[PDB]
Amino acid sequence: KVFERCELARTLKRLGMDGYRGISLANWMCLAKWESGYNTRATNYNAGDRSTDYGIFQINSRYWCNDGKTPGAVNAAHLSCSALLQDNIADAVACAKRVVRDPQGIRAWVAWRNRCQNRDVRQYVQGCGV
Numbered sequence: 001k002v003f004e005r006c007e008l009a010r011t012l013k014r015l016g017m018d019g020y021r022g023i024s025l026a027n028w029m030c031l032a033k034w035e036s037g038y039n040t041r042a043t044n045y046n047a048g049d050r051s052t053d054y055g056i057f058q059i060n061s062r063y064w065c066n067d068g069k070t071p072g073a074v075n076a077a078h079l080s081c082s083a084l085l086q087d088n089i090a091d092a093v094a095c096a097k098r099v100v101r102d103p104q105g106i107r108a109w110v111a112w113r114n115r116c117q118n119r120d121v122r123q124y125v126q127g128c129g130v
């Protein structure tokens, strides 16, 4: 599903992302925008390393979700990448939380560094009531 900007912002607040490990909702929004255009169906195959990025946050199959086809990856005891292609983003949020629990935080996503860090990201949440 393709989320409307404010619909997404309110959803992320409800799932407790505002200020999670010091990350503002505006930062999480900036991240979803440049990663998938707020599209839960988004999939990006990295030919170079044979991994795939899945969902609204473009989570990778080598480190975080199991898809079976990715070489040198986390096993089948971990969350299925399919769970990140659902309309309901609860699993994706729970996984995004885990990713930033690493010392690297939100910097784990290179798109965040390019397009969001050291920027006025107020625009992503202005007028949403969050």
Ligand SMILES: *SC[C@H](NC(C)=O)C(=O)O
Pocket (backbone or CB within 6 Å): 063, 064, 065, 074, 077, 078, 079, 094, 095, 096, 098, 099
């Ligand atoms: S981010 C999803 C999570 N992955 C790892 C590697 O802990 C899981 O729930 O398995």
